[PDB]
Write a protein that binds this ligand. Structure first.
Ligand SMILES: CC(C)OC(=O)c1cc[nH]n1
Ligand SMILES: CC(C)OC(=O)c1cc[nH]n1
Lengths: 412, 412
């Protein structure tokens, strides 16, 4: 028998807010966080908008001198991590520091910093590269810096599974705890790929919406006029904790993490199978892991990226796993409002699923004006829907056909 | 509960060879794979040599049309993976495809492809960025592409823990199998960071040997005249398999994976603690996980990077863990010959530890002409040493204070 894993702290930066409550208020209000990007010249680019973190002050977390050593994706991950630990009320001691670890990841990592160092290298040569370039850019430095700042000596690692990172990081941190390798883990993801190589890279593959004239309507999952995903920045972190450890210190418990599934499509480098067969195996794996019947699922936070192929494949997977119950559950994409935070998408979407359980409200899919052929489920179009939610599922699918599913249940 | 995990296949690209047998021959001969770098002009750099993969032909594995879209680290990862799956004799079928996954990691990933696309962006513009930029450069796509080519539908992910990547990848893939998430995993790492940004960034940190006049003598772990690590390229992959699954099909078993340790130092972004406190915690976790008496350890494949602080912290950790027995075991650094493959270092060094068990020989630490103060263990100076080896341990330490230990033993 495994130990049980509960959520006792959450932290976030998103295009809707600098913490969880501000973000969640934007989610329930149906607000968009998408705007034209201000921090660079995008004249030559086919996409000029995305979800930026507005008003972030790294000096609430680090000295200006510490912060100069670290890429934005690392600053964002540290901010979500410090928020989640504070939110949990956990006290790190000599008695428990070896039982507390970190799994914070990223899809694309230190693109901005690499881009800024390339400028210096071609302009002036290698003498102008920062001494902190390597440690300040590598994906495991959110886990490393957090562990150094807080004295965490438990398992210390980072996942990178592109758009699935946040979901895999959380699920494998839950495994660490379930099988007794740690009592507490800080887990999630962070991303800041709005540089030329990000917008340019995804733009070259024709993956991005180009609705430059109306950025707030660009992200429209399952709508007949969708034209690709919206690139967004930010971070999510959750304090995962063994149940008996949480109860002993009187921790506030948001929800229980009951299931985790993984699968590979083994199909294509960027496209899903049109029946979403890998996403179907993943969800069934997560439900078998939790000991749940499909009929017990009330709410799905979809991957729902606003791509032609992805959105439909996910409807097919849900119809196949849930049969008739596909028309009773509610499913929405919060990416209609946040855009796609890539490696952080699963971390902020885990937090939205947990708060959907806490508040007993399904977040809306905004911009769902004309649902496409076969998109006939309850996708919570336009407006938040209060409803009963005992079980919430969160899905992430990524480049390489790598899939993750998390199942959260109410804890009483 | 926990199932046992064995090694049934191995694969490698290194500075010593284009497969496992050729690389291992070089190891037991005391041959250096370090040479002046040919593929670019380094006259502006303080380090002008390293361990390149010499004479690699990707058209032994993949069409030139596919290879053109993939960073070298992906090419190197696929080559090692294809060798390991063939070496295992495993047949992938509809009956087992959902039970075979992959965890191939990298420390920095597609830095050469990123540097080339940065040139295009700055010298020309974003219209010249490759449509294959993202899927040809991001770390999770060795796992991605390998699943696509072989039809692997099991757990599909990637670790990024800097110089610890290869050791954590193998260790967490063994956990997947032990706990029933998969019956087979392809696990290890790949690196190719030998571009301007890579040599420049490690250069800016003064981390690299500048022994340009004698490259084969630069990597000299525990020697008094060491002056930093040597940057090297390549990949290691291993087929991990549940014991009864391996027995059922009549697999050739190289060794058993009995122990895995993780720990965080929580000390510094890049420097080890002088007493090797985090390495010592990590090795003790691994030895308890394996159900062993520390006096059972016959051979240690050291991290042994040839840095002033790293090499001596590692002696201190070994003396603390093993006491008087630290004088009876043999410890060596294969980095003396290969240099530091970073994210792949733990993967090739796991394979070198397994072959030390098959052939009952400790690989040499070459270049160890004048051992430093307190470096008075058996460090197998100059020449390979045949001896009894029932238990072999492989250590990796990384930036962020991330630590990993693998314990292997002989199997009936
Ligand atoms: C991103 C792509 C590889 O996957 C999807 O969009 C998807 C949707 C349902 N299953 N996979
Ligand atoms: C890579 C660096 C942070 O750590 C080491 O070299 C080391 C040696 C013993 N403990 N850690």
């Amino acid at each position: 028998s495994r130990r049980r894993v509960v959520i006792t702290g959450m932290g976030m930066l998103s295009p809707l807010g600098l913490d969880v409550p501000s973000s969640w208020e934007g989610i329930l209000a149906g607000r968009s966080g998408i705007a034209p990007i201000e921090h660079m010249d995008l004249s030559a680019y086919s996409t000029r908008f995305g979800g930026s973190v507005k008003g972030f002050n790294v000096e609430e977390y680090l000295s200006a001198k510490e912060a100069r050593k670290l890429d934005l994706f690392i600053q964002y991950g540290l901010a979500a991590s410090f928020q989640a630990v504070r939110d949990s009320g956990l006290e790190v001691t000599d008695a428990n520091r070896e039982r507390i670890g970190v799994s914070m990841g990223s899809g694309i990592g230190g693109l901005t910093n690499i881009e800024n160092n390339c400028r210096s290298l071609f302009e002036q040569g290698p003498r102008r590269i920062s001494p902190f370039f390597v440690p300040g850019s590598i994906i495991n430095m959110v886990s490393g810096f957090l562990s150094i700042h807080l004295g965490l000596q438990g398992p210390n690692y980072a996942l990178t599974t592109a758009q699935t990172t946040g979901t895999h990081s959380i699920g494998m941190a839950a495994r660490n705890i379930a099988y007794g390798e740690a009592d507490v883990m800080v887990a999630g993801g962070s991303e800041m790929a709005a540089c030329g190589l990000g917008l340019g890279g995804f733009g070259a593959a024709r993956a991005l919406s180009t609705r430059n004239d109306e950025p707030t309507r660009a992200s429209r999952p399952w709508d007949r006029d969708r034209d690709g995903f919206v690139l967004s920045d930010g971070s999510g972190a959750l304090v995962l904790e063994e149940l008996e450890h949480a109860r002993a210190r009187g921790a506030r418990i948001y929800a229980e993490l009951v299931g985790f599934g993984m699968s590979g499509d083994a199909f294509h480098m960027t496209a899903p199978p049109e029946d979403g067969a890998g996403a179907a195996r993943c969800m069934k794996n997560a439900l078998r892991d939790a000991g749940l019947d499909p009929r017990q699922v009330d709410y799905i936070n979809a991957h729902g990226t606003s791509t032609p192929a992805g959105d439909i494949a996910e409807i097919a997977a849900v119809k196949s796993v849930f049969g008739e119950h596909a028309h009773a559950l509610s499913m929405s994409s919060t990416k209609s409002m946040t855009g796609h935070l890539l490696g952080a998408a699963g971390a902020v979407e885990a937090i939205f699923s947990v708060l959907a359980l806490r508040d007993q409200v399904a977040p809306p899919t905004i911009n769902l004006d004309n649902p496409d052929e076969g998109c006939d489920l309850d996708l919570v179009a336009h407006e938040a829907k209060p409803r009963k939610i005992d079980v919430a599922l969160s899905n992430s699918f990524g480049f390489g056909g790598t899939n993750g599913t998390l199942v959260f249940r109410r804890f009483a």
